[PDB]
Symmetry: C5
Amino acid sequence: PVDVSVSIFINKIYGVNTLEQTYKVDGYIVAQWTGKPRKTPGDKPLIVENTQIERWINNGLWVPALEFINVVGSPDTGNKRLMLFPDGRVIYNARFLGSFSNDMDFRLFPFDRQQFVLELEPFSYNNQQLRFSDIQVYTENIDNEEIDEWWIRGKASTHISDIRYDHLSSVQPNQNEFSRITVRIDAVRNPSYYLWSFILPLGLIIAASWSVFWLESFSERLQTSFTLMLTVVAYAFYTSNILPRLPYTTVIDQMIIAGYGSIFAAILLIIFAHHRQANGVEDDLLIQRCRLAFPLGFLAIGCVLVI
Amino acid sequence: PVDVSVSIFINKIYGVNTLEQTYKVDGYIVAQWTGKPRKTPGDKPLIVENTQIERWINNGLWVPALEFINVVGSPDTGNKRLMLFPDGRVIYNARFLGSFSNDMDFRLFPFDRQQFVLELEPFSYNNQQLRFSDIQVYTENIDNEEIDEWWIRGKASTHISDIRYDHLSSVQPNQNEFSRITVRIDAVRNPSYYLWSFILPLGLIIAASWSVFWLESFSERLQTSFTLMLTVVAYAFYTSNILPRLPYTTVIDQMIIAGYGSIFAAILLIIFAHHRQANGVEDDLLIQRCRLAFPLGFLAIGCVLVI
Amino acid sequence: PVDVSVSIFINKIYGVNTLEQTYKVDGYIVAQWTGKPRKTPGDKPLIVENTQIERWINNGLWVPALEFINVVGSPDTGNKRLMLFPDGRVIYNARFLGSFSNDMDFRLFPFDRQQFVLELEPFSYNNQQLRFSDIQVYTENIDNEEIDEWWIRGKASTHISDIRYDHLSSVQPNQNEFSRITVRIDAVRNPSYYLWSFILPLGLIIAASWSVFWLESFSERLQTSFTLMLTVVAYAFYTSNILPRLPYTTVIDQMIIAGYGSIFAAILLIIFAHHRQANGVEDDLLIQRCRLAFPLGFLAIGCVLVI
Amino acid sequence: PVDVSVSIFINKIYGVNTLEQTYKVDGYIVAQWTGKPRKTPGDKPLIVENTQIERWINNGLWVPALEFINVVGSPDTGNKRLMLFPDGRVIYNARFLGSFSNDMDFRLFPFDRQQFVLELEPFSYNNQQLRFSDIQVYTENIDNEEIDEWWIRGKASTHISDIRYDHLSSVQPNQNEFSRITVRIDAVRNPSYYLWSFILPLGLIIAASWSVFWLESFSERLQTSFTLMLTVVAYAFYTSNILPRLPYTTVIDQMIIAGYGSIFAAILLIIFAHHRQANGVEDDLLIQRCRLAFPLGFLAIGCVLVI
Amino acid sequence: PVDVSVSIFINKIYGVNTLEQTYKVDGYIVAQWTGKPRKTPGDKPLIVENTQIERWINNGLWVPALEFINVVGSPDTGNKRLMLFPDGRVIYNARFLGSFSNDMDFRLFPFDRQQFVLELEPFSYNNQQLRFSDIQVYTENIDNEEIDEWWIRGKASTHISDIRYDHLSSVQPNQNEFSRITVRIDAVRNPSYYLWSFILPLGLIIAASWSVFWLESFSERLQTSFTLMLTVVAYAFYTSNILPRLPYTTVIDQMIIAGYGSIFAAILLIIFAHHRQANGVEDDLLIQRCRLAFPLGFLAIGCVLVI
Ligand SMILES: CN(C)CCCN1c2ccccc2Sc2ccc(Cl)cc21
Ligand SMILES: CN(C)CCCN1c2ccccc2Sc2ccc(Cl)cc21
Ligand SMILES: CN(C)CCCN1c2ccccc2Sc2ccc(Cl)cc21
Ligand SMILES: CN(C)CCCN1c2ccccc2Sc2ccc(Cl)cc21
Ligand SMILES: CN(C)CCCN1c2ccccc2Sc2ccc(Cl)cc21
């Protein structure tokens, strides 16, 4: 029941695809497993590069297809070598680049925590078993990830479990448990750019929205409101175009509704102030001095968005 | 004849293409059919991975080409294996990723019901027949599909029918009926994001449009109208850019015309109010008090849009 | 001088590319031609699927390369089979998906008439001749093409002509005429979506533009004009972003200039009204009552855009 | 020292990539060169299609690799044939589609002159020499290029030169001259669409900008200015989004700055008019009658942009 | 311990991908290494083109797989030849196009200094050693790079170092040092287009923002502010859409915050001017004459953004 040692060097993780829940991984994979000893030229181990490998299989060299359970489409394989040893053991080494899939919650958008994952498992073997898994990452955190998009927290999570697959296990009675290496890296989104360039501007916009109450007239107040309305729609548009498209509301996306909200609530007061009066036309004395009472009400409702 | 058993494990459905009427499906396919018994090493069934399979065909191993009738372009095949059994039976197992086509009506956009479908059929065989079809999906609904885009309703629809193909059936008299497995999964779009972030803001915009009638002057009313106009045009643009492009009007797209409508009707009234008078310049008393009569008229017309 | 029968099943026409003048076609092609009789296993015709076909050629099986003259780049071939008959005749069957090119005039944009075309011709043979061509489409019109983008008018146009190629016809004296099947289907664009959601809103915008003359002041008129100006620029952008990019002006594109025009003509009038006076400041009495004279002038010039 | 005749049929030039300085070319290439006579079946020349060609090379048929020096990435080769003649001569014929590179100055954008270029050269041969080059283009100009994007001026420019490659010419002393066919077609951009739909609207915008001086007040002038400001930014965005992205300023891009300019110069005057006075508040009499002095000043500076 | 000479011809560097930190490089690679002498036809060196090379490997011709350590995904290889010499030495020559990765700091965006790099290293060999590296670039700077995007500063940096790889060096005790050629060219972004068409317009916008203080009223000042607000949001959008997307703030991106700032600071002043009074309503005399005190304060804070 073959023992297989696996090592995965991760070179670069890039291009998140928020809608598809998808990321790209470039790196090498290495499998080691000891076979029947053989004679090599010299006694030095034998090297078999790329195209040559497939020919060695046509002569009965077994090389297991190791599948990336969670890759979306067969990955781009760059170079591959076999290292055949005189004492039997064999090393398969190949570089890959593949688009991998995992579940990703983006609802806390500018302040994400995500988990990038690889799942390796032999494509047709249940008593060939993944001996031990080792993943080599060569980075540093908190660090250069002001230049880089993501903040890794954890380093090394491994598994190597056994997967059941209870469907048509009578195709082969008593044996359908496959050996699955699971590799998972934890990361945090860098919430600088989105605060410094999206969160902040929007707040100023919502803030300046409230300054509508310090207009003297009523016509001034109500008309200016419509320009504030336009300003949010504009800023909603600006937000939407640049930010990652999703099927749920982000934090930013909520704040944008909060904008749409405060402004439309203003409209109501501004008008109800005019027509809650003792005569025909008296702006209600205290009410249009919600000047420093809208900011508080918004900020009060903006601390229950948090919990 | 030949009886062929088929099993389809569905791993992921993603990336709908509204314009092309197209979706992406990643999963495995398994075919099983019993052939002439053979001698395998040991008596254990024989495994043939990838490249090696094509070599076994050059020696007369028949392996039927199974086509995805409704795939748009040949799909990306990841790994494939044969399981040759000593008692004859043979198992073909391969992972696929393909862009599939089906008829898709998107006119009720934020509230979709769709039917994602696979059609499998042998490419050159009419008395080789699909024994039984089984589809293995491992998800759950209503559930995580707040994080996920779609709500699956039904589970398992299968068919396995016979297709006629009456065109040049004299090429082979009396026999042109092909065995077609049909798999179809029903799903609903998650109308959360689009209401909370598109439907709602637009309504607030259309609502605030009506507040034009609570402006005192006429110059105020008519001028402000044009800013509302801009506001919709802006919001139409924002809508268009982010939402899926189509060749028909969505529900949202209608509401956007309702905006364009209410605003241009306002302009007419606002102007007709001014010059339907007893003197030269008397704004018609009751009419500019369609303040709470446009909302009713719009909401009345917005309850016949439903039926 | 070989006779070749051809049949083309068209499965889907999708993804027009206005700029490249390009469309995608998925379907099957079938070629039939009678050769020297042979012994088949049994007397049943022999089936040769995909990879195996190329092996049969290495043994002297001639299979002519049929080129798609008007495909842009080698197409995606899905599955291919040979049907070798004991009485000699041979059937080549393969599914294709390819991006095809044809001349396409889009100047009458939302009201297009287009002609989608396939051109087949052997790549190196002049006395091998296309016997007869048959095209199988299974759709219906006027019908589902409210859900579908295009209205097919004609059904079936075929040709099968002879092409000259007078360039280096001394490379082979007296024989350079190639047999070319030409298939062309006529279709009309579905002018619903673009009217109900683009043409109409623009008209309402342009109409409301004229309501500038019903502003009492002159400052009101001239200032409001600039908001109308902005309104068009906004709507031009909205138009441009969503509509298919082209190297000529569409019908919609003309209407957008008419906006830019009337508004700038308004500016001129609005200002010329002010300073064509008997005193220093008398708005010219009749002129700013081009209220229901601009609409007429615009509509008159919009009936010579048609002829 | 082999003489090679080449002919290049050009089918379509499309999809310019302004940023990458890149265009797509679909067409056929044919190479002819006389070799040692051979026996063909019959005495008719022998045809070798596609896959069969590579097999004929495995038996010592020499077919020179002809490289497209200026293709960006190996091109899509569709079909290839050999025509082996009994008297020796051999014809290589293949269809290609490739993305080609050349230097492209787009600074005079809507009024471009460009030169689309092919460079062919053997990949490993210096005394195999390109006998003569012939290029077959089948179009017409000035003509259909209102429907088409470009105006070809010249027809056929050819070269066929000798390239030195003085770097490691001691790898092979005295002989490093490669034979390079160079083909270049001159073309002009069709400056209709960009004038009728971009240049013109912007001028109207800039023109109407000057009508700010015909506003009576000062508050009217300065406030309206900011709306003009907004109008240009709007039009700049619309411009930028639709027009080809570049690393330099186009003509349009300059005109867009001219808008930004006149409007900000207006602001200065409008304000300087107010406070260059004899009392506290007297708008300077002659200056705000730069009404027909800004258009002149702009038009004067717009005649030195030309030379 | 094989000595290998390498030469790298760089044909084109294009298509920077700011987000992925990635650029495209088209060029040729040449490897030379002296092997066991052999008999060639004639005594002229032997040429082996493309497909033929792989056949020569099946007969024991060793040709080392040279990997591009920093290429993202296996690169597009166009043409490859071997030049086998009678005296043993062998030349591998092939054209490549690949997307290469390197660390790229874009925080000083319109004024970048970047370093485009190739890292070559054998895929499975430690005592086969890269003798010397030579890179051939044929361009010129400062020059055509007004038409071109980038300014190369340095010419030629080479290395050829030894890499440790201390992980599973017991897989082969005492020998895990690989020979790595490193090539790096230094380049600067062309800060013309981004100043003349983005930086400049924005300054005029921020400048004209300050002219809000020269409005006579308070209602005039506060209302106009909101139009300025809209103006920036518009210009941020225009910027964001066209400029390269990043996960940090560019210089331009900061200037956009400065706009958002000055305008929101204006609003406070404008309002605090109104309500810092001796009576109920006296605009504070000196304060709304921060007319030429906001420009100084902004420029003062705009000289500490630099250091
Ligand atoms: C500051 N450093 C964390 C930069 C690393 C960025 N990069 C990355 C990108 C997107 C999501 C997750 C990651 S983690 C990671 C792990 C290994 C390597 Cl080699 C690269 C990465
Ligand atoms: C929330 N969970 C129901 C996930 C559903 C996502 N996914 C999907 C995507 C777009 C349209 C329809 C579907 S249905 C479906 C059926 C089976 C599987 Cl395995 C995945 C999917
Ligand atoms: C309901 N009907 C409109 C269906 C036709 C749609 N489809 C199509 C699309 C774009 C342009 C032209 C066509 S024609 C056509 C011909 C054959 C087939 Cl199989 C499909 C199509
Ligand atoms: C009006 N007809 C000259 C069509 C022009 C289109 N076309 C083209 C497109 C972009 C850049 C350059 C050219 S030139 C050219 C040369 C040969 C052929 Cl076959 C087509 C073209
Ligand atoms: C103006 N001329 C220096 C052209 C430089 C353009 N190109 C380039 C593009 C983007 C980033 C860096 C470079 S450097 C370079 C080095 C060699 C060659 Cl062949 C082309 C380039």
